[PDB]
Amino acid sequence: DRPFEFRTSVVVSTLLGLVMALLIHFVVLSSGAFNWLRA
Amino acid sequence: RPFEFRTSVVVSTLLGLVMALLIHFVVLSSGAFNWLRA
Amino acid sequence: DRPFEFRTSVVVSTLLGLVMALLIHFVVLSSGAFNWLRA
Amino acid sequence: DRPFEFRTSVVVSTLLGLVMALLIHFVVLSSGAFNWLRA
Amino acid sequence: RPFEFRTSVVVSTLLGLVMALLIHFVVLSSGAFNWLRA
Amino acid sequence: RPFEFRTSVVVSTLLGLVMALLIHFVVLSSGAFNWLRA
Amino acid sequence: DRPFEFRTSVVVSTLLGLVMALLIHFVVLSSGAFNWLRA
Amino acid sequence: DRPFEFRTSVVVSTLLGLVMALLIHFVVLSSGAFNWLRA
Amino acid sequence: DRPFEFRTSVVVSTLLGLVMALLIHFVVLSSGAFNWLRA
Amino acid sequence: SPWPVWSGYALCFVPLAAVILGFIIAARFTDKQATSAYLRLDPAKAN
Amino acid sequence: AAAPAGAAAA
Amino acid sequence: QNDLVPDQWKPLFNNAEWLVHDIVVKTIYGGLIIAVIAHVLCWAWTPWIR
Amino acid sequence: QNDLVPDQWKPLFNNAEWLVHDIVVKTIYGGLIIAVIAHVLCWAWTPWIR
Amino acid sequence: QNDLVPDQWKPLFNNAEWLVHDIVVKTIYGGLIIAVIAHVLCWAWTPWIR
Amino acid sequence: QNDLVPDQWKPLFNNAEWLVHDIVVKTIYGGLIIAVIAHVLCWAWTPWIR
Amino acid sequence: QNDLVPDQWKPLFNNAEWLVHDIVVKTIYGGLIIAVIAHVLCWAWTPWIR
Amino acid sequence: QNDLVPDQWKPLFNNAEWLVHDIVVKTIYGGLIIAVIAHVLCWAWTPWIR
Amino acid sequence: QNDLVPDQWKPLFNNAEWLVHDIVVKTIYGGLIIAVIAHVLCWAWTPWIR
Amino acid sequence: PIDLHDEEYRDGLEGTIAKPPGHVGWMQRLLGEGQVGPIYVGLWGVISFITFFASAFIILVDYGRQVGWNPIIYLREFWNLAVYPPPTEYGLSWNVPWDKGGAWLAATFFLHISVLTWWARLYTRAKATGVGTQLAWGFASALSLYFVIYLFHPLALGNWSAAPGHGFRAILDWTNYVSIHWGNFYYNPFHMLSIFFLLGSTLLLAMHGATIVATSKWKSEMEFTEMMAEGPGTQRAQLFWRWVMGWNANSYNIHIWAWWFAAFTAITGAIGLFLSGTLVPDWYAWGETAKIVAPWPNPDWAQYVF
Amino acid sequence: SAEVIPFSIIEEFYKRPGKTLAARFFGVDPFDFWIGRFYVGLFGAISIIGIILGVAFYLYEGVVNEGTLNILAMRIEPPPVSQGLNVDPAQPGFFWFLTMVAATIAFVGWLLRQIDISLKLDMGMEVPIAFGAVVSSWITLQWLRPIAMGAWGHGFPLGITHHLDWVSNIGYQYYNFFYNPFHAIGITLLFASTLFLHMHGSAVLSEAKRNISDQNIHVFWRNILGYSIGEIGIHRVAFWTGAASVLFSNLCIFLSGTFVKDWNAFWGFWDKMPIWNGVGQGALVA
Amino acid sequence: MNWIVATFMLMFVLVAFLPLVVSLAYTWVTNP
Numbered sequence A, C, D, G, H, I: 001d002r003p004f005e006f007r008t009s010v011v012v013s014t015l016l017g018l019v020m021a022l023l024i025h026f027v028v029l030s031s032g033a034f035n036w037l038r039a
Numbered sequence B, E, F: 001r002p003f004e005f006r007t008s009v010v011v012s013t014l015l016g017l018v019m020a021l022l023i024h025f026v027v028l029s030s031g032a033f034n035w036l037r038a
Numbered sequence J: 001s002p003w004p005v006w007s008g009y010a011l012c013f014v015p016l017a018a019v020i021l022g023f024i025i026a027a028r029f030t031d032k033q034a035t036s037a038y039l040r041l042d043p044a045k046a047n
Numbered sequence K: 001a002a003a004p005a006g007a008a009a010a
Numbered sequence L, M, N, O, P, Q, R: 001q002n003d004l005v006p007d008q009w010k011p012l013f014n015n016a017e018w019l020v021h022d023i024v025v026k027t028i029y030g031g032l033i034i035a036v037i038a039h040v041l042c043w044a045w046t047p048w049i050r
Numbered sequence S: 001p002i003d004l005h006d007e008e009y010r011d012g013l014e015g016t017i018a019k020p021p022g023h024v025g026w027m028q029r030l031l032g033e034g035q036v037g038p039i040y041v042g043l044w045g046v047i048s049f050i051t052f053f054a055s056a057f058i059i060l061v062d063y064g065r066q067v068g069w070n071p072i073i074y075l076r077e078f079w080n081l082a083v084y085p086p087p088t089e090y091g092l093s094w095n096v097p098w099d100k101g102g103a104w105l106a107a108t109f110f111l112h113i114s115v116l117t118w119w120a121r122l123y124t125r126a127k128a129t130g131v132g133t134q135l136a137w138g139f140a141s142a143l144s145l146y147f148v149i150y151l152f153h154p155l156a157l158g159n160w161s162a163a164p165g166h167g168f169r170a171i172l173d174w175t176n177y178v179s180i181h182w183g184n185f186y187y188n189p190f191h192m193l194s195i196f197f198l199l200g201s202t203l204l205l206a207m208h209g210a211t212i213v214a215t216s217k218w219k220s221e222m223e224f225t226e227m228m229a230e231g232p233g234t235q236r237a238q239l240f241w242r243w244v245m246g247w248n249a250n251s252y253n254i255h256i257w258a259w260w261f262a263a264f265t266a267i268t269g270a271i272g273l274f275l276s277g278t279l280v281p282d283w284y285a286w287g288e289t290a291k292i293v294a295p296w297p298n299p300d301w302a303q304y305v306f
Numbered sequence T: 001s002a003e004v005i006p007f008s009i010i011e012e013f014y015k016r017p018g019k020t021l022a023a024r025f026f027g028v029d030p031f032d033f034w035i036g037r038f039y040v041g042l043f044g045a046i047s048i049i050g051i052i053l054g055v056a057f058y059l060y061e062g063v064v065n066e067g068t069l070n071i072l073a074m075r076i077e078p079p080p081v082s083q084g085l086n087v088d089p090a091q092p093g094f095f096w097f098l099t100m101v102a103a104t105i106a107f108v109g110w111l112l113r114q115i116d117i118s119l120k121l122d123m124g125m126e127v128p129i130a131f132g133a134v135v136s137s138w139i140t141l142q143w144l145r146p147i148a149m150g151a152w153g154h155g156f157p158l159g160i161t162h163h164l165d166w167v168s169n170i171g172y173q174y175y176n177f178f179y180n181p182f183h184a185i186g187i188t189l190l191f192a193s194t195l196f197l198h199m200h201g202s203a204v205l206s207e208a209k210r211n212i213s214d215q216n217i218h219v220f221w222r223n224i225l226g227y228s229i230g231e232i233g234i235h236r237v238a239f240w241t242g243a244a245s246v247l248f249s250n251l252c253i254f255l256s257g258t259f260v261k262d263w264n265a266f267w268g269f270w271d272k273m274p275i276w277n278g279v280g281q282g283a284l285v286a
Numbered sequence U: 001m002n003w004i005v006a007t008f009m010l011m012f013v014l015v016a017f018l019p020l021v022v023s024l025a026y027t028w029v030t031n032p
Ligand code: BCL
Pocket: H010, H013, H014, H015, H016, H017, H018, H021, H028, H034, H036
């Protein structure tokens, strides 16, 4: 009956958040604007 | 259960996300703004 | 009833933690920032 | 009834421990830090 | 029974044979020992 | 009866034959013994 | 009923003997250690 | 009732004649023996 | 009950003869041994 | 000579003719078998 | 008697 | 169940779908406002038409 | 079933789903606070807009 | 069945699930403490932010 | 069945599973002791952090 | 059936199987003798162990 | 069926499994003795740690 | 069909299985001696350890 | 006299494992069946398993030796590692070093044994139930090309390096190299026949699947009971293809078409590959003498240059 | 229940007038009749016009304009790429264009005709979908890719042996084509399709004229692989795999002249990821 | 390269995938 199950929304939001966190971390690391793990 | 509303909202969300990612990468790789520079 | 099962959440958390630990260890080893395992 | 079966936990723990032992032994062997099996 | 003795025996025998073969191959390929040299 | 004798016989015979063939191949490739040389 | 079958053992023995004969002939004759069919 | 139908004969004859006419026209035009369609 | 049918024999003989005749004619034509259809 | 070599006939044109003729014959026999009279459910009752 | 597979069963 | 949903769109929406649709439109309006503010700030930083 | 769920959200959330939703929203609030602090500290370290 | 589970979480957890959850919680707390100590020691060794 | 199991862990173990569990924990304790000794010996041989 | 088979081997063999077994063992013995002769002849030709 | 098995291990073994288990443990002990001897000989030949 | 098997191995062997087992143990004992002789001869030929 | 329950729920070497069976839900929804297991293990299924894993063990240990026993480089370089046959300086000789061709020889021998015993397993399990032995001969037609690729073509050419390496990228490399060596493979006529039969097989598979799914309201996919008396779905499929093409087939001989179209592919491929090096060393030159190559005197090469 | 029917009753029962697309748009189908065994309609006349014109244009371009009676030595070629997307009756490639256009009409007409027949027998739309996959293959090769590239000279020549020279030259211009991921997916799906076809044919033939039940084949397929798929799922998998094989190959050839120029360089990123770059020494770097 | 025509052609190539996806979704929905 419901348009959306709560389980699907939770799963999709968690997966999207994890993927976005990884993508932003890799883009910022590759840019070279910050020192981070040099040497 | 009708399939129109859920399909419409899913395709709208996917379009919005893809468009935002594409525009952000296009602006980043152009160098017009300072943003993330060495 | 219950949207999620406890077993599924436990399995997902364990797998995610293991993968994350391996990934971070590999990145740090390949970066060359720390002495660690050197000839 | 029961969330986890004991047999599956035993099997998973055994396989994971074996895999980690092999991985760490090969990493340390190929790193070249320790003398071990040389020439 | 939750545990079958036959399965444990078979798994142990296979795992021991595989490990012995692997160790022999690594040790011979190492070149540390004077074993089967032309 | 948990253990069958026929399974033991078949598995042990096959493993012995496989190991004999593998050792013969390895020793022939090594070149340490004269054997089938020129 | 019978734990062991004679027909199966006969078939297996014949196949094994044929395979071994072919393999040994090929291995021995391609080594170049014997003077067989030389122009 | 009868081994052959009149309609099938008419159809086959018409198809064959049309195909043959087109093919002969193309071949005779390609041969170059006649001053038929030249700039 | 007859082992073979006469129709099968006739069809096989006719097909085999036709294929053989065409092959021999075209093999002899391109050999250059006989004058035949020589420009 | 404007003619192909003998292996041109043996390897190219004979297999081509054989494929075309075999397809025609197999199709003819398939259609002859499929459009004959045998056990079927009655279309009037079954529908 | 006549059947789809070409077999004529009784 | 067709309650609190106007009769015009009853052959399309339930009440749960009505609530989800309301949430969606509110989210859209908030996002539009924030996007307008972001574009104004970026223009004040560096204009892209000259 | 629909006991702890408020009357407005009865057609959407079950009894267990309400508790799960509460946990999720509290987690999101905590994550937002931590993200704000992290962004402020990173701007103090090295500004990314010049 | 649901005897030792507190009445707040009864629609979600069972007795066996409650026990396994307690084990998991304690393991996570111990791991967090050890990870904090490891990070402090690694920074004292060589800082990764300069 | 659930006779040798203590009252706390009745909803999770049998007698057979309890015996196998005891064997597993003894093995893990012995392995941990051996591993600690091995790590100390390898550090005394050549330290791996410099 | 089970008439010419010795009493020791009744639960394994039959009449036809016993006859085929005798044929097989005689063939194996003949082949082994021929193989020994062939190996001696080949060694006389060219020794393969040097 | 469980007469030879000691009272402690009745819920896990039969007579047949008990006999097979005894065979296995004796084989493992013999193999361990041989392995210790082989390692001592190999170290006397060439040590693998330098 | 258990009259040739010793009373200790009744829960594991049959008459036919006992006969085949006797064949197998004799074959293994025969093969071991030949293997030992072959290894001694090959060492006398060219040792593989230096 | 076949007891299917006994054939599926027996113990011993001549018996099944993976009992009690399992159930996958998404396979039940998408495919219509969800039960997994039990699976028969016998004598011919234990000889295939052990020999396959012997060959796989040899290949993977040699991969590790090439990488240097480094797991990270092993993961990085996994899809472009390979075990190659001995080079051309050796002939068909087995006196080759282990890292220059011995491992390939051992692993290939074990793979040969495994595929043969798998054929035997298919044959014997077909006879154990009440069905015919048609999958076994289809596998034999498939194995003809396999044995030409790995055994017979190197034998007739005189070297083991004419055979593929064992790797993910090495099979594509073998395809490229073998086409380049012997002229151009596009002008191989049995290559043309093989492509004819492969594309026809894909055409026919798509057609049959679509037409059976389309008429499934009347249970046309129960092809066992349709071969005894045809109902409305089969009649509709017949009328569809008669009104489209002008001729149709049965619920029986369509699967005959399927079997033979799939079988001819491997046989024509085996013949073409075997002829490729031994009788015709150059396929473009042969096609030029056979009048099947177009002249092309003034190409427009601006298409092919950046 | 079942008796002997002579197949004339079968065909006469199922013939009805007017349930096609043209009957739903215009209210009547102008060509709603049968010729022989074939059903003619709208899209059956259009298709036949396209077929006849395409054959005639192909043969005129081959026999005339090239002067060859050898059918395997013809090069029915598009205009040069210097002409752009322009059509000119006074230039060499013109007839190629005509042929191409005619074929498109024929192919598209065929597709629509199938839909009509599917509507006459109250069936699903699976055959039009499976055929539209390969019609889209033709459209991608001959329409979309040349328009994106910018010239009609990027389409394939239509000779029997010469359209393979185009395949060879295009494949070696974007070397290595085996390294194209969509190409690999397409080849995998082709091989799987042929394997599935052989398996289904063998399975149905092995149980045909026998006094057994319908459960023997399930026991057989479960003793060998551990899983039996069913009767609706074998045919569904056939349909889906056959369509996907060419659907994935459309991308491989479209992305060659556009967005990519070299499939060996495409993989240059793989060894540069932070997880494993900078871990080996010697020829084991990168 | 125009890059605007190429994107529309790419969208057509992608929309060629739609009927098979609808077939899979129909099969999933109609078989609960
Ligand atoms: C150098 C070459 C010459 C030339 C030399 C010739 C010669 C020589 C001949 C023609 C003939 C023809 N030429 Mg001219 N022709 C030239 C150039 C042209 C050009 C042009 C634009 O350049 C055109 C349009 C034509 C047109 C024609 C046709 C009117 C005619 C072919 C009849 C036909 O198709 O039979 C096929 C028609 C059918 C309907 C097929 C059926 C025929 C079969 C064989 C018999 C079955 C009949 C059937 C059962 C009857 C049932 C009734 C039907 C259903 C109606 N020619 C040039 C100038 N041409 C032929 C002719 O005069 O025929 C009367 C002929 O012999």
